Protein: DNA-dependent protein kinase catalytic subunit
Organism: Homo sapiens
Amino acid sequence: QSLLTFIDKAMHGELQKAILELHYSQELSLLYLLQDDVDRAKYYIQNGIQSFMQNYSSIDVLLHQSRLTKLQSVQALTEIQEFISFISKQGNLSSQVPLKRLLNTWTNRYPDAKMDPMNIWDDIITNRCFFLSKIEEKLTDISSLIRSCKFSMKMKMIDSARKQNNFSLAMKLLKELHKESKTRDDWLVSWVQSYCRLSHCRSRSQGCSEQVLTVLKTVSLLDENNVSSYLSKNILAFRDQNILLGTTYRIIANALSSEPACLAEIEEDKARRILELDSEKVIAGLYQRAFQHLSEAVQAAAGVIDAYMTLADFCDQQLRKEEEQAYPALVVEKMLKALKLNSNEARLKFPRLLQIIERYPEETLSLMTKEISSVPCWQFISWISHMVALLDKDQAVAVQHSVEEITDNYPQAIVYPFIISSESYSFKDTSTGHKNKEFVARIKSKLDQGGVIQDFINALDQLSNPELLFKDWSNDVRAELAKTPVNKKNIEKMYERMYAALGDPKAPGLGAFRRKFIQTFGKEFDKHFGKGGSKLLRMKLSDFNDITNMLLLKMNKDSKPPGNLKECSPWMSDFKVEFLRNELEIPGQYDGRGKPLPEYHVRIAGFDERVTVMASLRRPKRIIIRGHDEREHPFLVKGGEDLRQDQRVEQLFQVMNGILAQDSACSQRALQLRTYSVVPMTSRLGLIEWLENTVTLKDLLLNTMSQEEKAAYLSDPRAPPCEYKDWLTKMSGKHDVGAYMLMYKGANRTETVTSFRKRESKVPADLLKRAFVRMSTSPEAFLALRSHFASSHALICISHWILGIGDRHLNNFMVAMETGGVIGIDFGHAFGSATQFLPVPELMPFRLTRQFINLMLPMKETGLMYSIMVHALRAFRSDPGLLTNTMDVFVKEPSFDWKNFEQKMLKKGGSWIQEINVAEKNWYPRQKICYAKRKLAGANPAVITCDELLLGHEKAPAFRDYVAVARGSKDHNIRAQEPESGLSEETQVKCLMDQATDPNILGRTWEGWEPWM
Amino acid sequence: GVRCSLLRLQETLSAADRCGAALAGHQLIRGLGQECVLSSSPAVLALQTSLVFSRDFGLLVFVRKSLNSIEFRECREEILKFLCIFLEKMGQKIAPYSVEIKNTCTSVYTKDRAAKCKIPALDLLIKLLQTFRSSRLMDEFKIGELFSKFYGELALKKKIPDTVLEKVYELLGLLGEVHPSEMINNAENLFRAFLGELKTQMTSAVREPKLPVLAGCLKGLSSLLCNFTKSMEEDPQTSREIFNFVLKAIRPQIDLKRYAVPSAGLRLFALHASQFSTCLLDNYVSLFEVLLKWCAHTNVELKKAALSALESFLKQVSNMVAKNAEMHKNKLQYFMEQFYGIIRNVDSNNKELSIAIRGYGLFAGPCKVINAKDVDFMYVELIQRCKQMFLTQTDTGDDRVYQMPSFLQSVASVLLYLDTVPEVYTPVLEHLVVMQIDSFPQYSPKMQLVCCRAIVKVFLALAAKGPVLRNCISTVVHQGLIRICSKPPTYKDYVDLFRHLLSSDQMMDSILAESLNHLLYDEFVKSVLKIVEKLDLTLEIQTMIPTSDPAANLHPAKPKDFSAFINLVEFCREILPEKQAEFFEPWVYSFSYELILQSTRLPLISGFYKLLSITVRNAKKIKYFEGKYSCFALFVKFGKEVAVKMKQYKDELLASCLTFLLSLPHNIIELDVRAYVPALQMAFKLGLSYTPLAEVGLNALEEWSIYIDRHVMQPYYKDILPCLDGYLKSALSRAAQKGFNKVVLKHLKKTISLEEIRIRVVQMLGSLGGQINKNLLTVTSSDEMMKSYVAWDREKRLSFAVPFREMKPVIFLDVFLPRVTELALTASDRQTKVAACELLHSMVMFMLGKATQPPMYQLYKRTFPVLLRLACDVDQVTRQLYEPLVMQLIHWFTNNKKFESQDTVALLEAILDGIVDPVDSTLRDFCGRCIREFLKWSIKQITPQQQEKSPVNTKSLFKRLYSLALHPN
DNA sequence: GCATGCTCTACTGCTTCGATATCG
DNA sequence: CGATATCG
DNA sequence: AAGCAGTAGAGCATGC
């Protein structure tokens, strides 16, 4: 009797109406229907709806998330509307069918988890149970139907509150709900199910001291009923009980394995509880109990897929612990039993089988054939590039007929990895080593029934640039021959390609299609190629490439590459689709994920009679080709680069932002990755996607300045390039690379910071906001221009570190001016090696210069990017470990086994040249995954940098000064003051953000990285 | 305006200066009553009902709190005169104030003193209680005070002067009419009082019998002798006395004015005919004498009253000579020779023959079996009168258009009892019926229902005879449809006649002595297909490039057939969808097959799709569809066909085929919804400037979401929803002016918006879940929203220096433009659109004018694709501008101050991707004319002085033409 | 050619006032 | 002269 | 009876 009297006296006058009815009207209608004036309530709710529309109308179109917070309330508004209309009209007097229909449309129409926060959840569920209680009191099976509706909505609210990190509300609701689940049985077992699942999710967030106590709490609540006379009735109740109890025993035996004995020191009765179920004779006991419960679980829709998968992961981490039994049989058994069904996590769990077959060949390989025989073939499509290189490996015959099923059904995608694998495939002497020759010949025959794909690859090949291949040949011979001519057949096997492409003007006319400029350059290679065909065929000269040097000097003079047409490549200029020749079906499709239907696939129809050449370090070319489905598609071509590892890291991006769309707090801010696409047609030739009106970052920052700001920045003696290089030469005495080794003995920590500020002072700070006001001209849109750019840039600068990438200078960042997103490209170094194998090691994890700082004025740069980075890492380290195993089988996959990597560094502008001699070893595919697992499992990021710097630059002259630069000073940097291991997320990202901006680190770094701007 | 006058009425119910604001309050009530009739809009009609039903201002308490005053008498009278016209200005939404106005009229009978104020309260009172029919509310009209209080108002009142003494007898017969089940135990003394009152009022010695208590007592006698009708079965004493009462009440030769009592006696003997049955033998001669006298008194309502009393007496005479056929030979002989003498053929103009017609048609009945040969010359003589009297094609001087349904009912009633028809005059009879049903809209109410009963009577008559005659009814409706559809009265009074004949046959069957509506609906659908067969609707081009095909031929072959085709489709819309219950079973396949067989031959004729919409809507109104399979798969092949046919059309056909497409059953067509989703995409885009397609699109999205399985549609919500953001952003004046003096009331009796869609969109968007709604705003965030949110250049050129006398500041006269062009493209407002166009023309001239002494080719490309779509847009003024402007600039850009500056090739590519585009069809035609002008003045100037490396030359655009001719697009 | 709508108007009638027969 | 009708 | 107002009913051009 407190609020209704207040409102019944306050409802007078004008000033006690023009706020109180302008604002609410809806809870006003609610308390009015509590006092039962439905027509007054009808007026107030219609005013509520009209106020919703009027409040909607004045908002803008691009102010996001306020539209969403307004829009979510309309479910509640029309729920009150349906209730008042249902209780007014009385055809529902005693006929129960409107109650049945309303129960059905209530239990169908649900607010979803992971996008609706708990306040709106509370609003709609409180309104719904309140209206149901109103029907319960008004109109005096059916009430038990009402009670089941109430509890089902409540437990749904519980299981939605678990996912969105809101544990205390579910604690309070489960605490108030236990007195309800005593008239029934399944209510009680779902109560204890939700309890143990919530304690599971709490334990991952909890510390090890807290972990043991909460799991002792849930096993203490696992001493009650629901085992008697219902696990026989519902066998799935027994199954899920065994699942959860095995998960508890799993997590406690996980808990007493990280710290050796310190956890088993302080308890008395719970210490007796540990050992009643030494110090190893109960660890193995808990592991045996967990395996026994998981065995009963997999012994007893889609309620058993997870039961298989947890036992698979259990034995998998057991096997990884063993290398760092019948369990390798059991894991492949239940894993393929899972993958036969429609799964996704098992679809990402294929290289476990692909490596455990090689490691355990005697362990039931006939079972592997027999189980891989019975599988739908629309699954393996994403994992084809490993199985195509597996044919050279002995015992490649655990599956052949499903592979042939996939080829005979969908050959037009597998045609691209097969040329790459057949380029290097050498079998053995045994009879199974000739059956593999028979198999590769029969599938080379079952492929290329048309005989036009190879022709298309050739026609795309012969539009390239000849000087680039000339430099490639010169560096290849200077590498492989100038040391010692002990190499078998390599000089001829390289010279056959040099004579085929860019030889005489008629050998490409016979073995390929004559392009309209090989008659200008392969013809021009006649007189200096006569001596080439005379002596260069079998020279073994091993000393001399100055004749190659003077010819690459005088072969850049008349270099003209703009054909600007498709007379440059006369095959596709006159394509003119004729009939069924089993058409090409443009590469870049068949991602997997279900049954691919090629009737909707786009057929490559026409090409464009104009090309544009780019300005990069390889000068690529684009095409604007046109498909059968009436549109255009642009693409860029790249000749002489391997493009398989980049496809793998794009697949890694795909799986990690598959993880990002699963938990709550990152989904509610909609954080994704701009995943473009590559295709490796043959080795050293691939097609890359190109997106729409996209500017490089250095292009934007150069275009922003004035005409005189440009010349004062670049063409000046006080240029921060020239000033930095002049100061670094004067503080060294020398003039080239190696002065970055002379600087770390003879420079102090703070005077270098002042000299850094000297060049920081020159360039302005408002350049990014000047470029952002140059285009926007609207304070309504400036907010949603800045916010999306900052969000995306923080997300990519925190996902470019979990897998360690380096070499991020300004040209590797692509901003889309129409929307305001930023995406990075050009993955050079997959794990932490770009600071290892360079002369001067860059030590920052990612870019954070003064421009991202001075855009965030007047905020400190510790509020906006901080929240999204801590949400990123809290989303990362709560996984079963998919990213770990996928990175492991990526780096262990043979594609860059140090020779491809050194050839790739020669394929770019190579700062590193030679003098390796121990770097052939210390590649070490155990150390990289070990240290990535450390830097995911909690590690101070001043320790990982020291670890890889020691591993890469042991016995270097300037090493400890490098570590002392990247070590702190115990007063100026928090990283020297923070510990070295066992950290948490907020202090992790605090150490990381302080590590990023650190004016000793930005003092001495490579001048191409351009650290000032 | 409204309700402030009512608050002034509340402030002036007790304001000062008694007898000092009577004219203020009176002009207040008259001012509200003016604009309470001067609004033909139901929104304010729904407003004012809730206005007048209030308890603070208004009427219900103002009739109780403003009585004892001298300051406002005209106000008290004007409100009770205004309420009795607002009783029927609205409908019957005054039902929850039956008891409120009951205690109101108790209060104003008691407390008020005046009589000229007492009368209009009684007016609205009795008209309200007549407006109510026997139902719940009369049970709370307490007869214990309604009879007894107002009956002791008779008793405990002497010198009851005139106008309440009549009104109390009006009240007690009013409630005798409406729900007399409360009036069982108050019957005996009241009729004794009714005898004694008129006894002392008329049969006294020296008193002048004044009219009003006679009128009241006779109306009460009629309205109370009906519930307990007193025949020769109740009391054979007051039957005799009431008989002599009403007969002296219709005594002739009393020539006077104010003919209340004779018309009252006529209206009473209209009802009470069959009651005084055995006393209708006494003075039948003088009964007929006064009937023949007062039949032609030449007073306006007295004619109708006289003929109604006349036909009622003739009906009872025919009934008594029917049921008592033994002793009545003399009586039937007298009426026989009388009517044959009056039909004899001498000079009878429209009086003796007009009474001859009805009595002849009625007396066909009795003598039908005594002789059977005079019955044979019966209807032969009747045709030999009516055929010669009708159809003379006298353009000036034969308007017997008010006498017709009498003739029709008579010829039907004589057509009944015959057998073996002379059957030669039947193409005169059917011509008579089609003439009468043709000249139907120049009638009045209560003429129309008599005519409807007549035509239904004759259709019942000539359908029990034989199927040799059952095709006259088939052909007369065929002729009638092509008559009524020809004349563009336009067609809008035949519609409810066709409704009344087949629909409300069921209220005709009672008095008159099956499958009638079956037969008439079958005949109607047969006629509407046989008419639409023989029409030849084709169009022929008269003697540009037409690339549309609802194309530039505005001329069809027979233009007077298209009018009687669109009148056909509108009549079909108004009559068809009612009652698809049992009759519309078999025609679902054959009629649909016929319509598509015609429409496949010609696509571009609208209304065919409207016929298809009508038959598919009745097919969804019936169930019938749970799998003939022929017509199922026929619609399957038809829908995809029209859904790919409707692409390159224009608006007025697009709306019709969309109303077809989204009215498919389509819960039974579960497949290929990806071909229906561009139709529903275009439907809401063509909403918000046209209502009913935007209504039916939501009405069908409801059907989709509530009846289909929500898994195929579960990805198909990302492109239905996110377009919906636009939704959630006469003689009454002179018949009211000069008082409410009831002739103005007689002349009053002679004479879906967007916000409901807003409410329904919100109810839909709420009822369709939480997890689905989120895509509604997440559409692209990269389109012309952001392109209106981008600067059109890096730096701003075109600095404008406004002229002043001292200062002259500068203004960037380009910052207005992304609102200026979106305004001038479509303003949706005819006053501001022309101003936007003039401003934009001057702006374009200025931006050209600065260019003779900075680069703007980033701006020209953003400028021109609205200059084209406004040069050839819609209106005449926006065509007369921007067309010579675009010719001026295209000829300037094809010149020597031109000649290969990026601006010229920019203009060229602008008009070229003007040519190649999806559906904007007229634009491509316009820029084809532009490239023709380009081809003219480009090459018709330059001599070969530099005409060898000009990339603007026609060879380059020939290569461009080859490129456009070479695409799989 | 007719039903109807715009005026006229004189009957009717309504209130107001006042001069005379009937019974304690 | 005083309560109650009468009537133009 | 005096002052005076409503009002049915009859009459003159007009639309369909």
Remarks:
- Residues 115-116, 161-163, 210-211, 257-258, 300, 394, 396-402, 442, 444, 731, 743, 747, 750 of chain B lie near DNA strand C (CB under 10 Å from a C1').
- The interface with chain A takes residues 728-729, 758-759, 762-763, 765-771, 773-774, 776-777, 781-782, 785-787, 789-791, 794, 815, 963, 966-969 of chain B (CB under 8 Å).
- Residues 962 and 968 of chain B are 13 Å apart (CA to CA).
